[PDB]
Amino acid sequence: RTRRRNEPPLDKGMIPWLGHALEFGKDAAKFLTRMKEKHGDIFTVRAAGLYITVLLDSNCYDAVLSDVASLDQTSYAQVLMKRIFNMILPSHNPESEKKRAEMHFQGASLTQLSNSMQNNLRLLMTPSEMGLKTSEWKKDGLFNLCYSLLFKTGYLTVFGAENNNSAALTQIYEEFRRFDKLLPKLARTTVNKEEKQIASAAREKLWKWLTPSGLDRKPREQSWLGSYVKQLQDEGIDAEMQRRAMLLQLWVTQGNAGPAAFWVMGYLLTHPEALRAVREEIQNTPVFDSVLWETLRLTAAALITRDVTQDKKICLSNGQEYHLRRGDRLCVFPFISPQMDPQIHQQPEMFQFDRFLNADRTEKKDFFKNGARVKYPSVPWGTEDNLCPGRHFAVHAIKELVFTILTRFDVELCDKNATVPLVDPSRYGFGILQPAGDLEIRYRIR
Numbered sequence: 001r002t003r004r005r006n007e008p009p010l011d012k013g014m015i016p017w018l019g020h021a022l023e024f025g026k027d028a029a030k031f032l033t034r035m036k037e038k039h040g041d042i043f044t045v046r047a048a049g050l051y052i053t054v055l056l057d058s059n060c061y062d063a064v065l066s067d068v069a070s071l072d073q074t075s076y077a078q079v080l081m082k083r084i085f086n087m088i089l090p091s092h093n094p095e096s097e098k099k100r101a102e103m104h105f106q107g108a109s110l111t112q113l114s115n116s117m118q119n120n121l122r123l124l125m126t127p128s129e130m131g132l133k134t135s136e137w138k139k140d141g142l143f144n145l146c147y148s149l150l151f152k153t154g155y156l157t158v159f160g161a162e163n164n165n166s167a168a169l170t171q172i173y174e175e176f177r178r179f180d181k182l183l184p185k186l187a188r189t190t191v192n193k194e195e196k197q198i199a200s201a202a203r204e205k206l207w208k209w210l211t212p213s214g215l216d217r218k219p220r221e222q223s224w225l226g227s228y229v230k231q232l233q234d235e236g237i238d239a240e241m242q243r244r245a246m247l248l249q250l251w252v253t254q255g256n257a258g259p260a261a262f263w264v265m266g267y268l269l270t271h272p273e274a275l276r277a278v279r280e281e282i283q284n285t286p287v288f289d290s291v292l293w294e295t296l297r298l299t300a301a302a303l304i305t306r307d308v309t310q311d312k313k314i315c316l317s318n319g320q321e322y323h324l325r326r327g328d329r330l331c332v333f334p335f336i337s338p339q340m341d342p343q344i345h346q347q348p349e350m351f352q353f354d355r356f357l358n359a360d361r362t363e364k365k366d367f368f369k370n371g372a373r374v375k376y377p378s379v380p381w382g383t384e385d386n387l388c389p390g391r392h393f394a395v396h397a398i399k400e401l402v403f404t405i406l407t408r409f410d411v412e413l414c415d416k417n418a419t420v421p422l423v424d425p426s427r428y429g430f431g432i433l434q435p436a437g438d439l440e441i442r443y444r445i446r
């Protein structure tokens with residue numbers, strides 16, 4: 001491989017064919033940040049025989065990705081669902097189900113879903129559910145606690161899975177965590193033999209449990225999940241692959257909200273002034289909105305991937321023209337820019353609770369890089385034409401959990417001086433970051 005005219009800088013690495021595959025996978029943010037410092041806002045890396053052009057000029061993300069004739073999302077999605085979920089969906093219409101997700105998670109459907117979520121969370125934060133039948137205080141990891149509560153809430157709400165009792169929901173959650181922990185390694189083909197066995201064992205249990213085969217529950221074909229299942233059935237997808245698809249939809253709907261709620265609570269518990277303004281506001285939620293947006297800036301790290309299906313000319317904001325080559329991949333990583341970009345957000349590694357608030361506590365919208373307006377200073381839900389359809393529901397759920405914890409419980413750090421844990425670097429690229437260890441807490445009924 002050799003650079004052609006106006007192609008991005010090329011970085012092959014020293015390992016023939018394999019290139020940067022290992023380093024890229026181990027900590028995508030560290031590697032792509034290193035590459036940005038070396039080459040600038042656009043560069044092409046070799047990884048496992050493939051060439052991946054990375055674009056980090058956030059002013060171009062929307063316009064570049066709008067070219068669906070030159071930039072395919074479907075092929076890499078198929079790769080991931082094979083590797084992670086052991087799934088193949090032949091003759092599958094992807095746009096029809098994405099349209100269903102948009103509609104089902106907005107408007108009157110959203111209000112219904114959100115009302116059910118509120119009800120379900122209440123059932124899950126009972127003293128008995130909260131492990132408070134033995135003692136005044138209960139110790140837990142905050143991440144584990146927030147993930148457990150929202151996973152269970154979202155699962156009950158989205159899958160309508162009341163057939164599962166309390167102990168059953170815990171079993172399902174713990175198996176999901178087992179699988180979820182190994183998901184990045186599955187995506188990257190970096191599982192060892194023991195991990196591969198664990199992931200496969202976990203998937204099989206989840207395939208069985210998420211489809212209650214033994215029961216005669218009449219399908220709700222007008223619901224989000226029921227209409228999805230009905231589509232697969234009409235497309236000729238067999239029962240077994242229908243079972244496997246449930247784990248895909250479980251991960252897509254449950255893999256982010258609880259982790260995000262953890263970071264919100266982590267940042268708040270470790271930032272007294274932030275927590276005071278939030279609690280005061282509980283007594284329109286402008287402060288909490290800034291808190292949540294700041295949390296997502298720091299922790300929403302989905303990587304956007306496309307296959308380049310034809311040669312494409314592109315212009316960065318400075319006017320320089322670059323050529324994308326057919327057969328390559330294009331990646332866009334909003335986590336690095338604009339979210340963690342020090343030229344847009346000063347001290348970007350710092351949680352500043354009011355970073356998106358003006359002096360008079362109005363919404364701060366004015367953000368700049370080197371004397372140029374930045375249209376989207378944070379991109380947690382994805383690029384403008386490919387937004388998370390569940391985002392409004394995600395925010396409702398995160399708010400509901402945070403509101404309940406602060407209102408109905410006393411929550412204390414076990415180590416009064418603790419800061420939030422570091423990030424597990426395997427999570428970069430897959431959505432909300434997860435902590436390396438946990439933040440140990442104690443809680444009691446307030």
Ligand code: HEM
Binds near residue numbers: 257303304382390431
């Ligand atoms: C903070 C929490 C969440 C974040 C940050 C988030 C973010 C994202 C992002 C960035 C994507 C784009 C896919 C990609 O390029 O990898 C996506 C897709 C999607 N999200 Fe969310 N999400 C969250 C929670 C949720 C929730 C609670 C739901 C629904 C209950 C949901 C439903 C979906 C669906 C159905 C897709 C489309 C999957 C596909 O078409 O392949 N998400 N999400």
